[PDB]
Design a protein around this ligand. Structure first.
Ligand SMILES: Cc1cc(N)c2cc(NC(=O)Nc3ccc4nc(C)cc(N)c4c3)ccc2n1
Ligand SMILES: [Zn+2]
Length: 732
């Protein structure tokens, strides 16, 4: 009930009573009126220097409204009827010194139509004087407006829209909202008004449900987030927040050692491969091979990597066609591991925390384990303090980090300042929870992003959350945090559009539990659809990163496209085969060479593979990495099915002579079909027979029927070959 006090405190400031001789009846009447307004919009008004004056008679007769031009003397009531300031009871003055003027009365309780107007004036203060300073209302509110105009019942419009909007043909776009700022603000206010005045609220909910709902959720929840964003722009607020935190960690800081500071700094800027050293620990024979390798000839060395290697040879020459060699690609594979940057946070993201993964040389594995085990000990003090309650921290992120495939079309191709609503809704779809397996580095007060960062997180730390303080106003958080996504919306900031993500920190065990129960649910369901034994572990969720929930909700959808595009009898025979060898359908966000289904079956470490998908015969499992973008694959489904092709290529070649488990794609008959039709499909498909078979099997089962035709009229002998194997497997 600190409630009533919050309002008393705030009101004694902004509220000025200046009447004749009833300064207790009138001074108590105002308290009754403003009490209906959300405590938070009053503080936001105080924030921008606004004040409320309760006066008698003609309100024009006040010092604050003298500078009023002989035009702004005529206002419109909530119903759109022209009036005159010297004949009205309220007025909110714009400008850098906001003013609210209210006449005196107590019949505000009785004569509701005036309270309605007074609130409408406040709503105006809210949408025009306050929210405008943080670029609101925006897309979310525009969506309410578009729901109303394009709904069947035109009553919602007849109650909130001025004819200007009523007669507008198309929907209200961001562009419209910019040219008609005054108009939208008006609608906002009216809706705020009806919602706030206890008697008209029913009307609102009766003829404009979406507006009621928006204003309902906004005044009870979302508004304090507005105050939050509003305070974030105040220099002194920003400085005040930073100081309380700097104080809370003052002891922890003064105690840090050169060694501790060395660790935190190394954790902010990775150490690049020092060319020189590479050359040394190389080899007399190897140097010779390196002395000439058209790095470009290979295909597993990114553009960034190839360049580095190029400069490696060109730096050892200072003294005295393109066939793809074997032991040469072996040499280039080894070096790939060797020329990666020392990046602790990157190591955590790739392994999802599983720092013992055989994915890199043992020497480097231990250095990572040592440094991490140490950072974990440094970041022991939690954010919780007596100096502050709820606390928000910020992080600017690149969407490619969550979903490179959607990241491809997030920014509008025409106007780089706009975000594609199409991809936005998709991205937002199943984004319910997130996980952090590395050390998040956030800002105390929000800061401008880098061009490729169109994601602006606003995170509500738990008092329990441990962290470390940095001098530049940032905090390094402890690994293994849990995050519940609370809201995802398009916002405009500094002349550009971003995706604001409102998230709350929770115990990681809470999120893991959801995933685990998902795995149980998804397997129950699919074990029934495939007729597998009740409790078999078929599908598995290896989720550890920031897009966490999507990896899970996505698997369901991928498997649906997988059953509606392939013959049920083929699936069953093939997956029974897989299950027989302990196979697994692994959906993950950690890089593939860290899923055991692949590494516990590797000869050498450098023989690892990372990509959108992968099939491992030795384990009979299919691996699908979520975050990436399959080069020739348009989406996750496709990718999965492509890998199921390799699985079929397996069971088929197995049914030829189980006395030899081999690939039916290795058959002499097929090596010829590839010799001829091997270049009529996808580029990727041309890589080799196993892949060509897989890309072909894929198109044949695409959702795009047109795509099925392409194989049948460009790969005849193949369309038939793949169909023989199907019927083969199906019957045998
Ligand atoms: C730079 C680069 C290098 C690779 N080797 C890639 C491989 C893939 N995918 C696969 O290798 N898939 C896959 C899938 C199934 C496979 N099955 C068998 C029996 C043997 C395989 N080598 C096999 C391979 C995707 C992207 C790649 N990108
Ligand atoms: Zn493949």
């Amino acid at each position: 009930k600190t409630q009533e006090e919050h309002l008393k405190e705030i009101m004694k400031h902004i509220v000025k009573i200046e009447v004749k001789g009833e300064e207790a009846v009138k001074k108590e009447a105002a308290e009754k009126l403003l009490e209906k307004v959300p405590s938070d919009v009053l503080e936001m008004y105080k924030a921008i220097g606004g004040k409320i004056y309760i006066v008698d008679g003609d309100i024009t007769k006040h010092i604050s409204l003298e500078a009023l031009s002989e035009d702004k003397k005529k206002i419109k009531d909530i119903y759109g009827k022209d009036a005159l300031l010297h004949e009205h009871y309220v007025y909110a003055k714009e400008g850098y010194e906001p003013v609210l003027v209210i006449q005196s009365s107590e019949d505000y309780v009785e004569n509701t139509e005036k309270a309605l107007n007074v609130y409408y004036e406040i709503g105006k203060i809210l949408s025009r004087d306050i929210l405008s300073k943080i670029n609101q209302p925006y897309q979310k509110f525009l969506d309410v407006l578009n729901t109303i105009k394009n709904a069947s019942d035109s009553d919602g419009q007849d109650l909130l829209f001025t004819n200007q909007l009523k007669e507008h043909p198309t929907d209200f776009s961001v562009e419209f909202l910019e040219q008609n700022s005054n108009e939208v603000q008006e609608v906002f206010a009216k809706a705020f008004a009806y919602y706030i005045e206890p008697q008209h609220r029913d009307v609102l909910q009766l003829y404009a449900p979406e507006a009621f709902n928006y204003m309902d959720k906004f005044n009870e929840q979302e508004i304090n987030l507005s105050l939050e964003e509003l305070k974030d722009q105040r220099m002194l607020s920003r400085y005040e927040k930073w100081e309380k935190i700097k104080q809370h960690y003052q002891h922890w800081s003064d105690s840090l050692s050169e060694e501790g500071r060395g660790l935190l700094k190394k954790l902010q800027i990775p150490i690049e491969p020092k060319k020189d050293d590479i050359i040394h620990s190389l080899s007399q024979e190897e140097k010779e091979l390196l002395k000439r390798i058209q790095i470009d000839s290979s295909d597993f060395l990114s553009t960034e990597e190839k360049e580095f290697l190029k400069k490696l040879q060109i730096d050892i020459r200072d003294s005295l066609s393109n066939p793809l060699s074997e032991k040469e690609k072996e040499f280039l594979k080894k070096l790939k591991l060797d020329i990666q940057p020392y990046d602790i946070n990157q190591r955590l993201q790739d392994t999802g925390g599983l720092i013992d993964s055989p994915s890199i040389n043992l020497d480097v594995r231990k250095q990572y384990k040592r440094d991490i085990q140490n950072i974990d000990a440094l970041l022991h003090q939690s954010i919780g303090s007596t100096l502050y309650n709820k606390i928000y921290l910020y992080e600017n992120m690149n969407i490619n980090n969550l979903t490179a495939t959607l990241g491809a079309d997030l920014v509008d191709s025409t106007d780089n300042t706009k975000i594609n609503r199409g991809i936005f809704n998709e991205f937002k779809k199943n984004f319910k929870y997130s996980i952090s397996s590395n050390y998040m580095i956030v800002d105390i007060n929000e800061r401008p992003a880098l061009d490729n960062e169109r994601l602006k997180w606003r995170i509500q730390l738990s008092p329990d959350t441990r962290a470390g303080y940095l001098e530049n106003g940032k905090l390094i958080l402890q690994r293994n945090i849990g995050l519940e996504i609370k809201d995802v919306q398009i916002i405009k900031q500094s002349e550009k559009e971003y995706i604001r993500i409102d998230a709350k920190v929770v115990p990681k065990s809470k999120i893991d539990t959801k995933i685990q129960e998902a795995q149980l649910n998804i397997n129950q369901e699919w074990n029934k659809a495939l007729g597998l034994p009740k409790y078999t572990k078929l599908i598995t969720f290896n989720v550890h990163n920031r897009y966490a929930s999507n990896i899970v909700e996505s698997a369901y959808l991928i498997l649906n496209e997988w059953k509606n595009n392939i013959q049920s009898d083929l699936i069953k025979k093939v997956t029974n085969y897989l299950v027989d060898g302990n196979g697994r359908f692994v959906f993950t966000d950690i890089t593939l060479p860290n899923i055991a289904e692949q590494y516990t079956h590797q000869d050498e470490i450098y023989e690892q593979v990372h990509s959108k998908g992968l099939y491992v015969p030795e384990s009979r499992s299919i691996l699908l990495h979520g975050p990436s973008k399959g080069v020739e694959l348009r989406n996750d489904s496709e990718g999965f099915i492509h890998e199921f092709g390799h699985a079929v290529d397996d069971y088929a070649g197995y049914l030829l002579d189980k006395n030899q488990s081999d690939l039916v794609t290795n058959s002499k008959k097929f090596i010829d079909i590839f010799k001829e039709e091997g270049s009529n499909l996808t580029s990727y498909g041309r890589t080799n027979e196993a892949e060509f078979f897989a890309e072909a099997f894929r198109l044949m089962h695409s959702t795009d029927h047109a795509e099925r035709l392409k194989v049948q009229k460009n790969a005849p002998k193949t369309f038939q070959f793949i169909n023989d194997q199907i019927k083969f497997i199906i019957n045998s």
